[PDB]
Design a protein around this ligand. Structure first.
Ligand code: ATP
Ligand code: MG
Ligand code: MG
Length: 265
């Protein structure tokens, strides 16, 4: 299914703040009824991929919450129908095997192995005696951050949905693996799934069908990657002018995005 937002604005509501902390003063923003997002416009066709990026605390996660219906659109129109699958920035793990963590209600062999392979989990499970039957405890505390993220991504991807919301799965040190995952999973396996990827990597904007850049709760840019280069030349030149920007830490990339966005308001 597609997704459309026409001139959407959303305000800080009581309880959204405490909800926000878990997926990653409040009551003051709530009292003055400040916008967390203002005049958001996007039109994503079925099967397209939208890359969302922006400065830190620009309202990327909230945009996702708006789609989940955890945050209401006081103004504007949000159109989309169907199941949503959400992969939060916080990578969670329930007691049980790796396999059991990925599988939802129904187990289906071809689907499962396809998701495991595309999420690059084969490289992981081959290091364990019991492979994907290996038992994990709550939080999967001895895995790497990348391993928890790939498992949690595979769980969300395995889910049969019409729209996938992937909040920042590509933010860890094992960047070459992340490059493979992005290619195999987001670009190939999910090529025909409508998907929104929150990201701080330029390769992802370059490969996206549509791009939304957020800053201070507003749309700094929305369009194609071609359009970004010609319409936001200052931003583009600074960001593409890097050698291997995508291999900086998540923190440095976000820091650069923020500084650049602040600069070119
Ligand atoms: N854990 C938190 N504690 C306090 N305030 C928060 C927290 N998370 C978000 N906010 C506030 O809510 C607003 C929207 O934040 P949101 O998480 O949607 O932005 P984001 O771009 O997803 O953040 P990040 O850069 O961390 O991914 C921001 O203005 C921020 O000030
Ligand atoms: Mg497509
Ligand atoms: Mg976030």
């Amino acid at each position: 299914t597609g997704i459309i937002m026409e001139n959407v604005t959303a305000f800080w509501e009581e309880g959204f703040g405490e909800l926000l902390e878990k997926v990653q003063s409040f009551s003051h923003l709530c009292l003055v009824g400040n916008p967390v997002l203002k005049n958001i416009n996007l039109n994503i066709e079925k099967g397209e991929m939208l890359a969302i990026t922006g400065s830190t605390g620009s309202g990327k996660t909230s945009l996702l919450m708006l789609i989940l219906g955890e945050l209401e659109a006081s103004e504007g129109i949000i159109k989309h129908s169907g199941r949503v699958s959400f992969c939060s920035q916080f990578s969670w793990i329930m007691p049980g095997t790796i396999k059991e963590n990925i599988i939802g209600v129904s187990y289906d062999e071809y689907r499962y192995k396809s998701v495991v392979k595309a999420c690059q989990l084969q490289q992981d499970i081959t290091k364990f005696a019991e492979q994907d039957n290996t038992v994990l405890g709550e939080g999967g505390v001895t895995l790497s951050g990348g391993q928890r993220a790939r498992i949690s991504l595979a769980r969300a991807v395995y889910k049969d949905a019409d729209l996938y919301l992937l909040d920042s799965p590509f933010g860890y040190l094992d960047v070459f693996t992340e490059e493979q995952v992005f290619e195999s999973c987001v670009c190939k396996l999910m090529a025909n799934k409508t998907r929104i990827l929150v990201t701080s990597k330029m390769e992802h904007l370059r490969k996206a069908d549509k791009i939304l850049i957020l800053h201070q709760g507003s749309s700094y840019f929305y369009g194609t990657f071609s359009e970004l280069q010609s319409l936001r030349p200052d931003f583009s030149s600074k960001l593409m002018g890097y050698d291997t920007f995508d291999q900086f830490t998540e923190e440095r990339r976000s820091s650069i995005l923020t500084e650049t966005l602040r600069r070119f308001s």
